[PDB]
Amino acid sequence: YEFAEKILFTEEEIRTRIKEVAKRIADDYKGKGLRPYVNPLVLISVLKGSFMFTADLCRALCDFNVPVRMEFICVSSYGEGLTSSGQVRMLLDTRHSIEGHHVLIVEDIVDTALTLNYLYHMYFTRRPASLKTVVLLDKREGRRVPFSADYVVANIPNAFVIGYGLDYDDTYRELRDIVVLRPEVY
Amino acid sequence: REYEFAEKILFTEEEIRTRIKEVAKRIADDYKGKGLRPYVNPLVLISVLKGSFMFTADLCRALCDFNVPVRMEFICVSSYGEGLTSSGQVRMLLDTRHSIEGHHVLIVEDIVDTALTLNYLYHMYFTRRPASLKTVVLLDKREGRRVPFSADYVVANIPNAFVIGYGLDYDDTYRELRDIVVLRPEVYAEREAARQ
Numbered sequence: 001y002e003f004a005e006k007i008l009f010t011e012e013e014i015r016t017r018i019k020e021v022a023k024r025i026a027d028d029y030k031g032k033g034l035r036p037y038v039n040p041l042v043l044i045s046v047l048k049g050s051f052m053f054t055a056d057l058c059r060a061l062c063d064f065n066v067p068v069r070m071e072f073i074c075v076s077s078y079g080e081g082l083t084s085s086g087q088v089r090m091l092l093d094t095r096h097s098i099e100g101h102h103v104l105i106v107e108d109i110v111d112t113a114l115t116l117n118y119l120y121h122m123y124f125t126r127r128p129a130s131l132k133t134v135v136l137l138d139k140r141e142g143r144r145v146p147f148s149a150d151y152v153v154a155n156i157p158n159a160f161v162i163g164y165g166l167d168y169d170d171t172y173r174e175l176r177d178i179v180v181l182r183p184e185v186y
Numbered sequence: 187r188e189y190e191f192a193e194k195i196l197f198t199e200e201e202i203r204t205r206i207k208e209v210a211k212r213i214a215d216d217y218k219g220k221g222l223r224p225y226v227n228p229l230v231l232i233s234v235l236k237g238s239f240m241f242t243a244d245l246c247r248a249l250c251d252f253n254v255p256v257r258m259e260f261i262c263v264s265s266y267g268e269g270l271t272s273s274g275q276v277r278m279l280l281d282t283r284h285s286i287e288g289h290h291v292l293i294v295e296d297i298v299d300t301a302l303t304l305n306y307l308y309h310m311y312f313t314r315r316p317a318s319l320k321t322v323v324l325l326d327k328r329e330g331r332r333v334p335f336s337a338d339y340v341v342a343n344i345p346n347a348f349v350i351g352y353g354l355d356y357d358d359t360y361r362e363l364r365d366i367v368v369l370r371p372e373v374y375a376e377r378e379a380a381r382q
């Protein structure tokens with residue numbers, strides 16, 4: 001890993017933490033009457049970065065017998081400096097309606113939270129039975145708009161991280177670990 | 187693991203992991219002569235959502251094990267919907283963000299059956315002049331073809347029974363299972379009935 005200046009989490013550490021958060025999530029819904037087809041926990045995976053976290057998370061949730069429904073959404077910026085409210089163009093949205101469902105937005109990282117805050121409100125206005133967010137990494141001090149994730153795997157400082165779905169110029173998403181990009185590389 | 191809705195388990199998580207590793211090794215050896223490099227020459231992985239999400243996540247990591255640098259592109263194509271059989275029509279819900287022209291592209295799919303999805307995808311992408319176009323499918327039902335199609339890499343050939351798990355679904359259900367199992371017809375027939 002010559003392009004990295006430090007290792008934050010190895011695949012093994014990530015694996016364990018996800019399992020813990022998944023158990024928490026499962027316990028938190030243990031009374032919501034989740035059932036396949038009619039009442040699944042809807043995971044709204046925000047592309048592209050969360051693809052890896054989502055694959056591992058849904059499997060950990062399955063370990064706790066939580067029936068899930070996978071949704072993948074793709075968003076795009078409208079242009080440079082066009083919004084501040086984190087408004088984004090929806091290229092791909094959920095296949096089913098979330099209205100009346102228990103929904104969980106899945107993200108790899110939250111920093112400024114502009115986009116995630118926007119998406120949260122958006123889905124909130126669609127009337128799901130419930131709406132929460134689970135984010136792998138949280139740069140708590142990076143906020144440009146107040147926003148709290150319901151579940152977080154790890155809190156991190158303002159470093160540029162890569163790996164485990166996270167990229168730098170669409171590179172390194174495939175690493176099994178999360179590392180800090182060497183500022184000499186960036 | 188025991189699944190009430192399963193007739194039987196086709197492949198366990200360990201089995202899939204072992205097979206994906208072997209296929210990734212082959213892909214690495216096969217692309218060695220292309221000099222793939224991060225930023226300038228990555229192997230473009232075209233992940234066919236929703237089904238391919240899990241295979242894609244595990245495969246890109248296995249490719250990373252063998253130093254194959256990749257660039258992920260997520261597209262979304264629909265054909266079966268909530269049912270058990272091909273609609274006969276393939277819908278492109280989301281296409282690539284970037285052009286594949288002049289790049290080495292590998293389509294990553296969870297299963298090839300009638301081959302209408304891949305046939306549609308191939309014919310679409312081939313016209314865009316990529317440097318090369320190959321396909322890796324986790325599962326192949328080689329005797330379900332309605333149109334001919336031969337993937338470059340196949341992790342496993344399977345019989346003609348409805349399979350779920352590891353990204354594969356029946357009415358957007360069971361994609362999260364760690365193993366690939368055969369769905370009991372009494373389960374999907376009841377659900378098809380309820381839906382009908």
Ligand SMILES: O=P(O)(O)OC[C@H]1O[C@H](OP(=O)(O)OP(=O)(O)O)[C@H](O)[C@@H]1O
Nearest residue numbers: 047048049108109110111112113114115
């Ligand atoms: O809270 P914020 O400051 O918005 O930072 C986090 C977001 O930015 C990144 O997405 P990106 O735009 O890089 O898209 P990507 O997931 O496809 O890489 C990351 O994957 C999160 O979605």
Ligand SMILES: O=P(O)(O)OC[C@H]1O[C@H](OP(=O)(O)OP(=O)(O)O)[C@H](O)[C@@H]1O
Nearest residue numbers: 236237264265266298299300301302303
């Ligand atoms: O060879 P074929 O008969 O075309 O069948 C294979 C395709 O059908 C399924 O997709 P589906 O249309 O169910 O979409 P999905 O990935 O979202 O589940 C499967 O994931 C393949 O993409």
Ligand SMILES: Oc1ncnc2cn[nH]c12
Nearest residue numbers: 111159160161162166167
């Ligand atoms: O550190 C980080 N690494 C990758 N993507 C993002 C987005 N925000 N912050 C990031």
Ligand SMILES: Oc1ncnc2cn[nH]c12
Nearest residue numbers: 299347348349350354355
């Ligand atoms: O067995 C099967 N399971 C899930 N999707 C498909 C498509 N074709 N055949 C399938």
Ligand SMILES: [Mg+2]
Nearest residue numbers: 046047048049
């Ligand atoms: Mg993102």
Ligand SMILES: [Mg+2]
Nearest residue numbers: 049166167168
């Ligand atoms: Mg990014």
Ligand SMILES: [Mg+2]
Nearest residue numbers: 266267355356
């Ligand atoms: Mg399907």
Ligand SMILES: [Mn+2]
Nearest residue numbers: 234235236237
């Ligand atoms: Mn598919």
